[PDB]
Structure 1
Amino acid sequence: EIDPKDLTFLKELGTGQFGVVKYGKWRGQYDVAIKMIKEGSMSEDEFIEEAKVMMNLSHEKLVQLYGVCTKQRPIFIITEYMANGCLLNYLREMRHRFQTQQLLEMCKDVCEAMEYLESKQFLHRDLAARNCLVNDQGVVKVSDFGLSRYVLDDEYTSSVGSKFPVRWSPPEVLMYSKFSSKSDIWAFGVLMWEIYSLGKMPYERFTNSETAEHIAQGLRLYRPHLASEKVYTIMYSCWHEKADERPTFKILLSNILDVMD
């Protein structure tokens, strides 16, 4: 529990999911990000209790949660400051002229965070480039892990919804809402595809409803031009029809390290 008086607000970062995010200082001169939760957007009592579980998650490639301000409204979410913002926008900025080795380390960083989360039996539930962040050093970190459990917006909750992550969902999630470590594996494969496609929308020429019916009949994301045949085999293994035939994040990490150049 961080005291709001022991926090400064210097610049506005954005207005993505949950509301406004601001840059500021904490104890004295610690670089922090303050996520402010918009009224009526979150199952607040349920998030406060889960925050205590989230505080104990500590990994190099996982966005660190320093604390919360819950003794006032709006609720403040105090985290690690990521100067280069969401991965999706970072990929879409063509000026970067990324090397495929830089694209592989972005995949390595996410896979390491997801291996740590899997070893703690924690599910992300919404893994995608939009939910990953980039710091000052170009390091990619997993953010907003398990947060969809507290979103009150009906558009994000329903599988046929306007804001449901259809393009990152396996057949068993769309058809039966069957969530498991294997639905996090599927989304990771889509995230690997987004990275090698430089932020292209998966199944761009399809609507959410067209995507849902085509993946159920075996349609998969094509090999991105920047992805080698070996890199494509890794993301492709995430999309097996049978959930139990998909690798763990431990297997995927060894596969990624195996093709490092």
Structure 2
Amino acid sequence: GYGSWEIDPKDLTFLKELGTGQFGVVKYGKWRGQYDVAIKMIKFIEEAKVMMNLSHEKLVQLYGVCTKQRPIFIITEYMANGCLLNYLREMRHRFQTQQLLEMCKDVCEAMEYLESKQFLHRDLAARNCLVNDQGVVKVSDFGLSRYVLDDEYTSSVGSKFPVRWSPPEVLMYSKFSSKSDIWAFGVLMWEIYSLGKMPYERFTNSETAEHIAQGLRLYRPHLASEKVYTIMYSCWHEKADERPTFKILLSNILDVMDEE
């Protein structure tokens, strides 16, 4: 069994529907009458192990599972503001650049933790992060949580590939490494500073792969200072070994926060 991880479904309440998709319905509810939760109802062992062994303040946390019945429930921490991509696109937030840098640091801390555990995420992107009521960004879409947010890469059986978040060696040779997560992180910083624009927005995926191969890089968003742009651009070195680590990126981000 899952021991302390197995939740009694009698302890869950269902308050509001958050979304309906390929892997089932997600509801907001309460657990044990006091904890706000997201409850996924699956329309497993391997993906469960991933979430039961990774824990960080900037990763969306698994609280437990209901597997003694069908359909299965996956219970996680509640992130009231939904995905980071839609949060960035909501122009009423009128974000200050200080807020945008804090979102970058939240994700960088999660990634530094993942890299310290030798875990490769493989689909880092603003659509795969969630935002809580306090505006804190947390990385999701790993293990069981891929099914929670009805991930299009997972639901399409790998057909919808994240071309726009991939380095040249992934596109050409399927060479995944810590350095392909570093590249995706720089694209995520670009999504944040662009207020959620699609990277390479006027190109198709095929054109993007061709231009990347030719050395095209995303332009500096107007909200990004030259120092912030240097950080995201460092993620896109043609040579994977010349890209920084997440520990280095975190130190760069803190230095900018201290300077600005």
TM-score relative to the length of structure 1: 0.89
Percent sequence identity is 100
**1:225 partner SS:** coil
Question: Deviations for 1:37-68, whole angstroms, at most 9, x for unmatched residues?
Answer: 33xxxxxxxx3233134222111111111111
CA distance in structure 2 between the aligned counterparts of 1:165 and 1:176, rounded to whole angstroms: 15
Does the 8 Å CA contact 2:41/2:72 hold for their aligned counterparts?
yes
Is the contact made by 1:128 and 1:168 (CA closer than 8 Å) also made in structure 2?
yes
1:104-127 deviation digits (Å, cap 9, x = unpaired): 000000000100111011111110
Distance in 2 of aligned mates of 1:154 and 1:138: 22
**Distance in 1 (alpha carbons) for counterparts of 2:39 and 2:156:** 30
Instruction: Judge conservation of contact 1:159–1:166 (CA < 8 Å) in 2.
Output: no
SS in 1 for 2:247: helix
Unpaired runs of at least 5, structure 1: 39-46
> 1-side partners of 2:38 and 2:62: how far apart?
10
Q: How many residues align?
A: 253
| C-alpha displacement of 1:16 | 5.2
Aligned counterparts of 1:131 and 1:74: Cα–Cα separation in 2: 24
Alignment map for 1:53-202 (pairs within 5 Å): 53-146=50-143, 156=153, 163-202=160-199
Aligned CA distance change for structure 1 residues 242 and 147 (closer, same or farther; 3 Å): farther
String of CA shifts for 1:53-99, please: whole Å, max 9, x gaps: 42221111111111112233332211000011100110001111100
Q: How far off is 1:187 after superposition?
A: 0.6
Hey, what does 2:32 align to over in structure 1?
27
Task: Tell whether the 8 Å contact from 1:126 to 1:146 is kept in structure 2 after alignment.
Answer: no
CA shift in 2, pair 1:212/1:17, >3 Å: farther
Tell whether the 8 Å contact from 1:123 to 1:181 is kept in structure 2 after alignment. yes
- The aligned residue for residue 239 of structure 1 is 236
Segment drifting more, 170-179 vs 155-164? 155-164
Stretches of structure 2 that go unaligned for 5 or more consecutive residues are: 1-5
Query: Contact 2:60/2:139 (CA < 8 Å) preserved in 1?
Result: yes
What CA distance in whole angstroms lies between the structure 2 residues aligned with 1:152 and 1:138? 19
Cα displacement (A) at 1:170: 1.0
Question: What CA distance in whole angstroms lies between the structure 2 residues aligned with 1:91 and 1:155?
Answer: 20
Distance 1:5 1:140 in 2: 30
* Equivalent residues of 1:196, 1:227 under 8 A apart: yes
Asked if structure 2 preserves the Cα contact closer than 8 Å seen for 1:203 and 1:221, the reply is yes
Per-residue CA deviations over 1:7-39 (Å, capped at 9, x if unaligned) read: 11111011356332110111232100012233x
Query: For 2:23 and 2:187, how far apart are their aligned partners in 1?
Result: 23
Say if 1:86 and 1:17 are closer, same or farther in 2 by CA, change over 3 A.
Answer: farther
Deviations 1:181-206 (A, max 9, x none): 11111110000000000000000000
On the 8 A contact 1:151/1:157 being kept in 2, the answer is no
Displacement of 1:156 after TM fit?
3.0
Distance 1:201 1:249, change over 3 A: same
- Aligned residues of 2:200 and 2:218 also touching (Cα < 8 A): yes
C-alpha distance in 2 between matches for 1:211 and 1:123: 23
Considering fraction of residues, name the structure with more strand. Answer: 2
Q: Once superposed, what is the RMSD of the aligned Cα atoms?
A: 2.7
